[PDB]
């Protein structure tokens, strides 16, 4: 950084903060003051790029002044994520006492560099976002090639993967310590992305959505009761949907909403995403050199009443899953696809038959993202798998609920009460009916009240 005299910075409450693309970045509290601006233009002889900042933040920066950072970097005990953030921070403060012998609490940047949609398309391109109300808007954040590359490795690494010219694209997930998730697509160099490295982040934000999301108009209360039922008698279900229609959220919602306190449940994920407020539960995560099948295969082995597979992507595990369905477990999982040939095709291509999946799969929800300019809508577009047919086209499917987008409504399409009968008896069937019509936003509390 450089200004004219320190006194002039303090008097006018402005501070240069960089030089990029032949221009001097000047943080300025009073950008309407043409006298001060023209004084800086004449005294520096440099073309300015003005950035507005809060007066006291500018003053603080003037008195405080990427170097203190150049040294705190060589402190391995800082980047280490194995260390709780509460302590790590302390080291950074005490280590910073080196320069001036105080503790600075809350260095914004020193922390900012150690500890719903973000589109980062290329080099020297302003980031775009999707705001909860404003939708697609441009942003005041741009990175040139070096900064892009650095972000790109940062995000890649925090998501647990190693992007490089050898492996230029990366479709991972960041686990925010607040248990929260986000989908990250990412590209290094320009081999796939001529416009330079780039990243996209579709934020989750989690702590897991509940059935309180008939607020969000996604699934009607009636259908959620039908699923509540369904999940109690162990009807197996897969949530299908194109990318980011809500598959994982919806799944987690359905398991979370049920009282699972009296049943042993039992989950296998490539990484954590599933939060459940339930006690009898075994959470299982893929580790180095394990296939999804290793964990499912050895897990079905114990006695799970309910099995949750994050998402079927090696179908050698898929096979174990539908096997679990045919012994009579309650299995549930997610699948990337947009309709019925999408899934069935997708499911059949590592060697499960539709007699085994469709015959033992009970329900298949299809999730969507509907957009009407700036509303962001996630809806269950639609599916009851009746079974197989001897001499056929196979997959016998009875569509219970469709979603009409023109009126944003869920219609019943030829489903009858005689369909969902599938009960071992009269008393069981009666219980289903009561839950049908007879059957507080937080997950802990909601689980707490489905429990009852």
């Amino acid at each position: 950084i450089k200004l004219v005299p320190k006194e002039v910075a303090e008097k006018h409450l402005v501070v240069p903060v960089n030089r990029a693309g032949p221009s001097l970045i000047v943080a300025m509290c009073d950008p309407s003051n043409i006298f001060a601006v023209d004084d800086l233009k004449f005294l520096t002889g440099y073309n300015i790029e003005t950035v507005v900042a809060s007066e006291v933040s500018i003053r603080e920066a003037i008195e405080r002044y990427k170097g203190p950072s150049l040294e705190d970097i060589v402190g391995d005990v800082g980047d280490d994520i194995e260390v709780t953030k509460e302590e790590t921070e302390n080291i950074d403060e005490m280590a910073k006492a080196a320069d001036d012998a105080p503790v600075v609490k809350l260095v914004n940047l020193i922390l900012m560099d150690a500890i719903s949609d973000i589109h980062v398309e290329p080099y020297e391109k302003d980031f775009r976002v999707r705001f909860r109300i404003d939708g697609v808007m441009y942003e005041v954040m741009r990175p040139p090639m070096k900064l892009r590359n650095a972000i790109t490795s940062r995000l890649k690494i925090m998501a647990s993967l190693d992007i490089s010219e050898r492996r230029l694209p990366q479709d991972g997930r960041i686990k925010i310590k607040m248990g929260g998730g986000k989908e990250m697509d990412f590209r290094v160099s320009v081999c796939p992305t001529l416009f330079g490295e780039k990243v996209v982040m579709r934020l989750l934000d989690k702590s897991n959505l509940q059935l309180d999301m008939t607020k969000l108009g996604f699934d009607a209360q009636p259908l959620a009761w039908f699923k509540e039922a369904i999940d109690r008698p162990y009807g197996m279900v897969l949530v299908t949907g194109p990318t980011g229609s809500g598959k994982t959220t919806t799944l987690y919602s359905a398991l979370s909403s049920l009282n699972g306190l009296d049943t042993n449940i039992c989950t296998a994920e490539d990484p954590v995403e599933f939060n459940f407020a339930g006690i009898n539960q075994v959470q299982m995560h893929d580790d180095i050199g394990l296939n999804f099948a290793a964990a499912l295969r050895s897990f079905l082995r114990q006695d799970p009443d309910i099995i949750m597979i994050g998402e079927i992507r090696d179908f050698e595990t898929a096979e174990i899953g539908v096997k679990a369905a045919l012994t009579g477990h309650l299995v549930l999982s997610t699948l990337h696809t947009n309709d019925a040939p999408g899934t069935v095709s997708r499911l059949l291509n590592m060697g499960i038959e539709p007699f085994l999946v469709t015959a033992s799969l009970n329900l298949i929800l299809a999730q969507r993202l509907a957009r009407r300019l700036c509303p962001a809508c996630k809806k269950p577009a639609e599916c009851r798998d009746c079974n197989d047919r001897g001499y056929r086209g196979r997959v016998a499917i009875y569509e219970v609920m469709p979603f009409w987008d023109g009126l944003k409504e869920l219609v019943i399409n030829g489903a009858s009460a005689a369909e969902l009968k599938q009960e071992a008896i009269r008393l069981g069937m009666s219980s289903l009916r009561m839950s049908g019509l007879r059957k507080a936003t937080t997950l802990e509390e909601v689980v707490g009240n489905t429990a009852p």
């Binding site: 391995d76 005990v77 280490d80 260390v83 190693d162 490089s164 394990l290």
Partner: protein
């Protein structure tokens, strides 16, 4: 009464723990792996006992306290300081570097107060004592004086011999201190040590059950030599793109034809863990053999002694 363990054997085990812990494995699983990869029983046996305390919920520092004859108070306190501050990973890296410097320094006095301190006093004055004792065999030697001179003049004339003794000392001190334009051509590249450490770390994380790519992402953050770190980032980038591990290695001179050919077998065999364990043991033993740090001692040892004796005679 119980003894510790060898400098070599503390080394191997502190390195391999620092490596696993900095990989984000659970501490108990780190402990299990190094025990299960150990060749001596006494190490595998202890490390099962240290792990047994860690699974009861004790800190690593408090679990190592069951072996105070092996991990001294300074070692535990370093661990416990790391555990109290949230820096167990970086204090284990420090301890691994410490143990490596300790073993290397041990081999390298002894080769050709502990043993190093007692042997280093003892070598530094052996000769200069010989010398003073030949020059104390009576009077009227080569270069002396008669005893009746005034003391100050007698002592100043001998200054020759006082000097030849100090030079003898400086030399044996130098041998004990040392001994324990194309700009890119001038950078220190990967050595034998750095390949041995790499191979041990990878042999270690594979034998434990981590995949190749998870082990490489950890290793690429814990490699000390910058050029090797750049090499390993390129190997990991190549493998993550779908290139075969032996083919990413074959691009880099530091991996011999035998290393690559052996790794290339391990890929087709699902036995990379162990291919790496045998490679690493081979390298660790080649490292500790690598012998000129002891011959050059002796060159300056007797060469200086003889220079003194010649000096006054003349």
């Amino acid at each position: 009464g119980f003894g510790g363990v060898e400098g070599k054997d503390i080394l191997v085990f502190t390195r391999q723990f620092a490596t696993m812990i900095d990989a984000g494995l659970p501490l108990v699983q780190c402990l299990d792996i190094l025990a299960s990869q150990m060749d001596n029983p006494s190490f595998k046996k202890v490390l099962f006992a240290i792990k047994s305390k860690v699974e009861q919920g004790s800190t690593f520092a408090d679990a190592l306290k069951e072996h105070p004859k092996v991990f001294d108070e300074l070692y535990v306190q370093l661990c416990a300081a790391g555990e109290v501050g949230g820096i167990l990973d970086a204090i284990l890296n420090r301890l691994a570097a410490y143990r490596e410097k300790n073993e290397k320094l041990k081999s390298k006095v002894k080769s050709a107060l502990v043993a190093i301190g007692v042997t280093a006093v003892l070598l530094l004055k052996v000769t200069p004592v010989f010398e003073k004792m030949f020059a104390d065999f009576g009077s009227e030697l080569p270069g002396p004086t008669q005893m009746i001179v005034n003391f100050s003049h007698m002592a100043q004339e001998y200054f020759f011999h006082v000097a030849g003794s100090i030079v003898a000392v400086v030399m044996s001190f130098t041998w004990s201190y040392r001994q324990p334009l194309f700009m890119p051509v001038f950078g220190p590249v990967l050595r034998k040590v750095a390949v041995a450490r790499f191979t041990r770390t990878l042999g270690t994380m594979i034998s434990s059950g981590v995949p190749i790519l998870d082990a490489l992402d950890v290793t690429a953050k814990t490699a000390g030599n910058r050029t090797v770190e750049d090499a390993i980032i390129y190997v990991r980038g190549k493998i993550a793109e779908g290139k075969n591990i032996a083919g990413p290695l074959a691009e880099t001179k530091v991996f011999p034809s035998m290393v690559v050919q052996m790794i290339g077998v391990g890929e087709a065999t699902g036995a990379m863990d162990t291919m790496l364990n045998k490679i690493a043991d081979f390298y660790d033993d080649e490292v500790d053999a690598a012998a000129m740090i002891e011959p050059v001692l002796m060159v300056f040892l007797g060469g200086v002694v003889g220079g003194f004796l010649i000096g006054m005679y003349l």
